[PDB]
Every structure is written in C-alpha cells, then in structure tokens.
RNA sequence: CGAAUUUGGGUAUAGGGGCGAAAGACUAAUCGAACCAUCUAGUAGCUGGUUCCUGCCGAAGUUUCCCUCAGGAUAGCAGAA
RNA sequence: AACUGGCGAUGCGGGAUGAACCGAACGUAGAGUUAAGGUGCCGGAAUACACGCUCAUCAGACACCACAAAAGGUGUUAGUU
RNA sequence: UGAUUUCUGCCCAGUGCUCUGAAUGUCAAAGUGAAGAAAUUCAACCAAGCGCGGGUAAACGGCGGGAGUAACUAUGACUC
RNA sequence: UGACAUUGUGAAGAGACAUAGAGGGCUACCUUUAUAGUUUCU
RNA sequence: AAGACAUUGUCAGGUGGGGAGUUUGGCUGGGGCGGCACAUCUGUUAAACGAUAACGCAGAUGUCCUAAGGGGGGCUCAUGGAGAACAGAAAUCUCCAGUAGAACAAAAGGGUAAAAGCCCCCUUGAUUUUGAUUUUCAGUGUGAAUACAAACCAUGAAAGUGUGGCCUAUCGAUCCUUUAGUCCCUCGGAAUUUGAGGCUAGAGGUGCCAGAAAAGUUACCACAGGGAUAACUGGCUUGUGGCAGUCAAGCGUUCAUAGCGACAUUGCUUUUUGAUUCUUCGAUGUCGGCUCUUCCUAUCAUACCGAAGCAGAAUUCGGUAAG
RNA sequence: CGCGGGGUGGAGCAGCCCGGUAGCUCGUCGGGCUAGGAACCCGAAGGUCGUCGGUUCAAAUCCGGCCCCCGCAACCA
RNA sequence: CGCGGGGUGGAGCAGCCCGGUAGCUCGUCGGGCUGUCAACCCGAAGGUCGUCGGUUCAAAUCCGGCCCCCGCAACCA
RNA sequence: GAUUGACCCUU
C-alpha cells in the first residue's frame, strides 16, 4: 500500500501549526520567590485576540 | 485385524537359530531425539534469519499406517521386526473368532 | 472513499469499511485508522457524570 | 465571477517517498510506484534471423519418466568412423 | 484407434485446377516403347469400326470429386401367367 | 454519516474492539529441584498473550424456515 | 511481556526440610507451633 | 519532582497485511465450473498372437482377515418334489432328483465337487538369508507374482503341501528421523566410559501416487508468445430451426386427397441455433439504425390462367412469373 | 413450440414411488343435560378417471386426432 | 505435534474432591377441588449408565487399548 | 394487599 494521511501528519512538513499571527506562548509568571512567599501585583495592560 | 500376542517363529539369535516362542508387541516410533546429526543440522540451518529453511509436508493422503510387530524371543531375548499390511483397526489382545454363534 | 492503497478503508464495489472499525491499542501505524482501543461504540444513553 | 476566489515571487514536503476537497489523481509531455547511471550483454522451455559450392547417405512426430502437455531426458529412426 | 501405403521430405505424366488420388519416383542427353489418361477443336492423337439405348420448355458426359432421395409417368426400350 | 424536518427498530450467537481475574487450562528464555562422572534427561510456578467470563452494533455486520388456530379459495391477531 | 545487566543502602504476610502431642469404624484434599542453606510482590 | 523504579543494552515469548519476499497443480473438443480418463484392477470397445486411443461403455481399489493363512480328515451345495402336530408358500424336513443352476471378504471375469465349498482336529511358512525369473519395462524403478537353493518349522499315516489370502487390484524414492542386528567399524595423540557417526533390514510419505513446502484479486494493469486456443465472417455438417414431398387412419352432413390430414417415411440453399476449430491473435474495426445499389424466390400486391365444399361479391388452393 | 406440472369429483383439491370398486370437502331417523337452537359419522353425488381401442395383474390413466403458462427462447454486440 | 472438565432419556443438566444406583419441561398414559374449561398438583416408556480388569461391604464416580464431537492458530516428517 | 383467567339462548 501507501503511507496514509495520519502517518504523514507526523513528519511535520505541511502539518505544522501556523504560528505567524500568534501573540506568544500563554504562560504563567515564573515561580521565583514572591509567588511562593508573598504576592506580586501586576497590571493587565491589554486583552488581545490570539489567532 | 487380530494378531495373537505369542508366535512360534524363526529366531536368528546365534543361540536359537531355529523356530522358538516369541512374545508379540506393537512397535512404537520412538522419540525423535535432539543431538542426532540431522536434527543438529536442521537446528543450525533454522537459526538466524530466513524463515523455514526446509520443507514441511502438507498433502497427507494415507489414512492408515503399516503396523509393525516386534517379536521378542522368550528363549534368548532376541528382537525381530515384521510389518503387516495396512489396517484401520489392529488388535493384539486375543478374543478369538467363534463360528457357531448368534448375534 | 479512497483506494485500498491509501487507507485501510479504501476500495470495494461499495463504500464500506469491510472489517471492524475498532482498532487494537497494540496496532501499528497504518493500521490505527478508525476507533482506536474503543471500549464501546454506538449511540450512548447517558450523560458525562464527571 | 468578492470569494473554500485568482495569481507572481520566496519557502517546505522526494520515490514504496511526497502530496491528494480522493480521480490511483499529481509529482518537468514519464505514474497502479518518477527520472539518471550501474548491477546488466539480467533470464526467457517463447518469436525472429542465422552468410560459399558440389558429392554421398538420409529421418522423426513414436516408447517410458518428468508440476510432464509450446520443453527435456530415455529408447527408436539417421550419419560417420 | 486397426497388419498398410503415402504426403510431410517429391519433382514428373494424368485427374482442367488441388500436399495426399491414378501412373510412375528424378544425373546430363539421344532414339524407341509405354503407363495412367486420352484421340471434334482448344490439344499431340481415329468427326475410327460395331450393336443398341436416349431427345430433356433445368439432357448427359468417367472413380477420389466437388452431391440428390422416397414416390411416380400407355415417354420409349427390353423382360413371367 | 453528510444541510433543514422526522426518525434512527431487533440482534453481542460470529468476527473485531474493550474489561476485573473467579482460572484442575495452555505457558518461552532465565531461574530453580532430582539423576548422572559430566555433556545432558526429567518436574512446579508469580510473564504477557491465547483461552474462559462480562460489555460493546451512530464496530464489521445480520434481520430466516417450520407446526397448530376461523364458517368465500387463501387468510393468522394467538400458541409452540 | 519476562529474565539478566545498568544497580547501590533498611522494613509485616505466602510455599518446603517439624526431629512432636489439636481429628473420624491394619485409615481423606486436610486450618497450625521452634523457622540459624531459601521466596517476589501487596 | 523522581529514584534503584522508569530509561538504556542483550536475549526470550506474544502481537504485528503496517511492511517484505514468494506461491496460489495438470488433463481438458478454448479456458472456468464439473469430473479424474493423474497410481491402479475386471469385462467390453480391441478388429480370434501380443500391443492399441477418446472426458468410450458397465463397474471396482486405497480396504478386510489369527483366519477369511497352512495341513489333514469327513461331508456336499442352490433348488424342485413327496413330507410333521400346532406350523402357515419362507422354522422344525426323512427320503428322491439335483453338473454346481450354491459358496468361495469385496468389483468383474476366470477357477473349483470324495474341493478351492461346509463342518471338525492340528497349527503359524503371514518365518530366515540372499540370489534368479514374469508383468508394466528403458527390458530402469516401484508394486505384484513365479520356480528353486540353503535353513528352520507346521500338517499328514504318508506321498506331499505350505515363502500369506483360489487367480487377476489393494500402493511409495533421495534426505531426515526411528527401530531391529552384529555389540561389528570410526570419532584421525594412546582410552574407563557416556554421547555421536557408519554397516544390513524394517517403519514414519509423498493419492499431482518416479514422490514442491504454497491463498486470492485485477474493470488500473504489464511482457513473451499463440490462430497449437476461445469471442465475428467464411468453410464442412444440418441434430435443431425453416421449407418441401410420398402413403393415406381420419376431418370435411355423404365423400381419403376442394381444403386438410394422423401414424410413419423421403428430402432441400443454409435467413436460426448448435457441433467443429481449417484461416486470421507483428489486429479483416463490433450491435442496431440511417443511406444506397444489386441479387434470390420459398409470390404479399399487381399481369394472365387452372381448381374449389367457385351462384354473385368476398375468399381459398395452385401455375408461368422477381417486370 | 424444453424427458416437463396440470386437466387431480358440486367448488376448493393436499399425498401422487400399485383402484374390497372415499385419491380429501358444512346438513338431514341418532350419542349427556331432548328449553328450539350452538364443534363431529351415514341409506344423496353432476369423477360411471377429460374417449375409441383390450401388449389388457383385474386398465377405463404410464400410447394417440384439444390449449396455454406456476423458475414460457434473454439473443445482439 | 504423548490432545482440555465432558458422551445421564424422543429434545437439554451437575450433583462424585474416600462408597446410600437416582430427578426439572414438553409430546404423552391416568386421577379431582371451582360447578366446568388450558394452566393447577400427584406414579410410568427411553438409565441394563458405550465388550472389558482392579477394590471378593460401594465402579454411572478413579485409572489403562478405542468411536461422526475438536480452537491447546499451543519452536510441526 | 401473591397466583381466583374465562362462562354462546328470550319479559
């Protein structure tokens, strides 16, 4: 037979994600010292659409 | 077919060399031992890659095997082998045929 | 709707899967097309119930 | 015929691989497995061809065995010594 | 599928023509005689000789072979009481 | 599978998928115990799988034939 | 999936090898004691 | 966080059309399906030596038997008749006939009467060694069988007979395994010994039966070929189809033949369809229709006639006739 | 006009591989309560087997003088 | 490929791990309650446990040659 | 709180 589509999806040639429009990885603040002994106050500058 | 368990028959025992009494058994094939040169060669050939390297028979046609009686002389304990024709049923136990009977 | 070269389901004179579409977890790549390691199939009468 | 639209350029995916809104489609006029060179003067019980003269002798399509039936071995038939 | 003879593998004379039929098998020539087949002309060779039969408004004409039957006819010819 | 609408019946015996282990079952290499002088020959068993057992058809798929029943010929709601 | 190696340090229960004491008229698979060659997992 | 567990290395057992490599009989009135004519046996075909074909005809084989083998002895079978008491056409049946009309494991054909059949007694020659021979035949094998030799046995009073089955079928190489025999040869630096390898005879099997280890599909297809071979035409044949005769039992109120015509029987080009496989598979473009020409006559109409169960009209049966 | 099934009693007709002359089919003097009535047997059959024969086991079917289709010619490439 | 509890009725079942030989429905044979009508409850056909040997208190139960059932798709002359 | 279902003819 032939290599089937779900097999082909793993070589990641045309099946990689389209990451151009994205705004970055959405990750928490790193767990440094304040997040586990006190708190730290940040400000929500903007709320945006991530493609 | 019914064969008696005893038989007067020639024994070439070098001590009898004449007709003597023999006990009669059926011959059993005997276990195919390892370390026989043929099995050793077969195992060596089958080791590795290449699959089955010799032929395995499939087209069986015979429905009976030839029976071999083993005749153990009761005098000198010399053994002899003799085959009969092909039979579906073979009995060594003697239950003689009786003519003047009903059923 | 493919040919048998393209998929386990392809081919036939009618569009049918042919063999059971529930595939073993121990299957291989190229075999794992369908319902992988399905405990049950068909329409289920129930809710998630967490 | 305003969009699952059309298209340039750049870029990625390479052969039992790719790619496929799926026709075994497309992958440089090549696709039910591309092209190039080599292994390779691949094998062919099958088709075709097989180059001067004269003289003498001169068949067989039958037997047996063969995964044997378009083939061979064997015996027969023929030549030469 | 039969004791065989041929064609294949073979020309020659005859069957108009024809692998196999008939005659006969083959060096190059010359005389004679023939085979099978023929002798009105084509065409070499008697429009010979002899006795009959036949006239068809689809005659017939020489084996293999290239076809005709049952049944009929005071057509005509020859044959018992 | 193929928009709406309306519905999606029965069958887990078969094949497949899945799930505890209740298991006189089968059960490799290694490991162990008898013997042998030793190469070796004999015995259980915590492996997985296969069995067994349960589930599952919007999994693959399947959805017959008989016997009896009533007064036009039939005729079967009903019972096996 | 198992075994061996990587691979090193401590903890309760299950099989034999009771030399012996709980049973039913020349006597059944049989629950259970010293555990100083032995056992893997919960 | 996790922890001697995962991981990793090696081996071992599962699973593994996801992938790989292969294979997927022969004969054959094309191939396929069927069958086995593939190894065999009987009768016939088979044409009075032998041999002899077809997917000819009627069948059979892959078994069965410690007796259904071997010897000896005694007896005679099937059937018919006259027969006893229940009791009868078919129990028990005493005689008389009885050439086998019975039986002999099975298919058929042969063979057999103081037996080769049926009873009874004994028995293991269905044993050992190796040769020779007949059939198929290459005068190879296999299978089967024949007559001896040298033994050892059985049976009988003995002569004799017996080397499986009354004869003609009932079966199997190499390699491997396994058993039996000498406990004989070898393990190559002398060997306790085990193990292994040899010598001779059997068994485990190839039924495609001189013996490969083997599933499909291709309407996506490929190559070498084949007119050795199918699907047109053409060719031979004409069963079948179509058409036409002969004879007349009857139908036609009477009346075989105006018109028909049974039971039989003789024929005609192939407009049917078969049967065959001669031509063509380095290709003869295929169904029908359209178009157009021509030909045949077994004449539907038209021309002219004969005949009717032809009064007239309308019909029906025939002739010359395809203009 | 297929070696295939039929003319299966007044309809309707199932076994069809041997007819003491029913190959199967509501009622009628009568079986227990007779209050008439409500399931089952016979002294009633238009098959004298579609009709002329006798190879005639009793035949008058398995031979013929009348029509078609319940898996009736799917064939042409 | 030394084959796995197993062969208990005309159609389905385990009782047995040291010895009491025997049953559940249908198709039946029979008996009645309710007054009578299927159901409703009570005894019987196929069981000599498929020739066989062992325990001389109990072999259908435990073993040893066999017969059309077979998934032990279990390193297969 | 079980299984008791049915019963063809006139004012």
From Swiss-Prot, chain A:
Q: Where is this cross-link: Glycyl lysine isopeptide (Lys-Gly) (interchain with G-Cter in ubiquitin)?
A: 45
- For the modification Phosphoserine, the affected residues are 51
Instruction: Enumerate the subcellular locations listed in this protein's record, separating them with semicolons.
Output: Cytoplasm
| UniProt similarity note | Belongs to the universal ribosomal protein uL2 family.
The entry's other comment says:
There are 2 genes for uL2 in yeast.
Q: What does this protein do?
A: Component of the ribosome, a large ribonucleoprotein complex responsible for the synthesis of proteins in the cell. The small ribosomal subunit (SSU) binds messenger RNAs (mRNAs) and translates the encoded message by selecting cognate aminoacyl-transfer RNA (tRNA) molecules. The large subunit (LSU) contains the ribosomal catalytic site termed the peptidyl transferase center (PTC), which catalyzes the formation of peptide bonds, thereby polymerizing the amino acids delivered by tRNAs into a polypeptide chain.
Give the quaternary structure. Component of the large ribosomal subunit (LSU). Mature yeast ribosomes consist of a small (40S) and a large (60S) subunit. The 40S small subunit contains 1 molecule of ribosomal RNA (18S rRNA) and 33 different proteins (encoded by 57 genes). The large 60S subunit contains 3 rRNA molecules (25S, 5.8S and 5S rRNA) and 46 different proteins (encoded by 81 genes).
Its recorded name reads Large ribosomal subunit protein uL2A
- Species of the source: Saccharomyces cerevisiae (strain ATCC 204508 / S288c) (Baker's yeast)
What lineage does the source organism belong to? Eukaryota, Fungi, Dikarya, Ascomycota, Saccharomycotina
In terms of the parent sequence, the fragment covers 2 to 52 of 254
UniProtKB/Swiss-Prot annotation, chain B:
According to the UniProt entry, its GO molecular function terms are: structural constituent of ribosome
Q: Read off the InterPro entries from this record.
A: Ribosomal_eL44, Ribosomal_LSU_eL42, Ribosomal_zn-bd
Provide the effect of residue 55 to Q: Confers resistance to cycloheximide, an inhibitor of polypeptide elongation
Major localization class:
cytoplasm
Which compartments is it annotated to reside in?
A: Cytoplasm
* Any single Gene Ontology cellular-component annotation: cytosolic large ribosomal subunit
Sum up the protein's function in the record's words.
Component of the ribosome, a large ribonucleoprotein complex responsible for the synthesis of proteins in the cell. The small ribosomal subunit (SSU) binds messenger RNAs (mRNAs) and translates the encoded message by selecting cognate aminoacyl-transfer RNA (tRNA) molecules. The large subunit (LSU) contains the ribosomal catalytic site termed the peptidyl transferase center (PTC), which catalyzes the formation of peptide bonds, thereby polymerizing the amino acids delivered by tRNAs into a polypeptide chain.
Q: What else is known?
A: Present with 13600 molecules/cell in log phase SD medium.
Protein name as annotated: Large ribosomal subunit protein eL42A
The source organism is Saccharomyces cerevisiae (strain ATCC 204508 / S288c)
- Record lineage: Eukaryota, Fungi, Dikarya, Ascomycota, Saccharomycotina
Q: Which gene encodes it?
A: RPL42A
Swiss-Prot record, chain C:
Where, subcellularly, is it found?
Cytoplasm
| N-terminal signal peptide | none
Residues where Phosphoserine is found = 47
Q: Which additional comment does the entry carry?
A: There are 2 genes for uL2 in yeast.
Please explain the role this protein plays, according to its UniProt record: Component of the ribosome, a large ribonucleoprotein complex responsible for the synthesis of proteins in the cell. The small ribosomal subunit (SSU) binds messenger RNAs (mRNAs) and translates the encoded message by selecting cognate aminoacyl-transfer RNA (tRNA) molecules. The large subunit (LSU) contains the ribosomal catalytic site termed the peptidyl transferase center (PTC), which catalyzes the formation of peptide bonds, thereby polymerizing the amino acids delivered by tRNAs into a polypeptide chain.
* Subunit: Component of the large ribosomal subunit (LSU). Mature yeast ribosomes consist of a small (40S) and a large (60S) subunit. The 40S small subunit contains 1 molecule of ribosomal RNA (18S rRNA) and 33 different proteins (encoded by 57 genes). The large 60S subunit contains 3 rRNA molecules (25S, 5.8S and 5S rRNA) and 46 different proteins (encoded by 81 genes).
**Annotated family:** Belongs to the universal ribosomal protein uL2 family.
Name-wise, this protein is: Large ribosomal subunit protein uL2A
Which gene is transcribed and translated to give this protein?
RPL2A
Q: Which residues of the full protein are shown?
A: 203 to 252 of 254
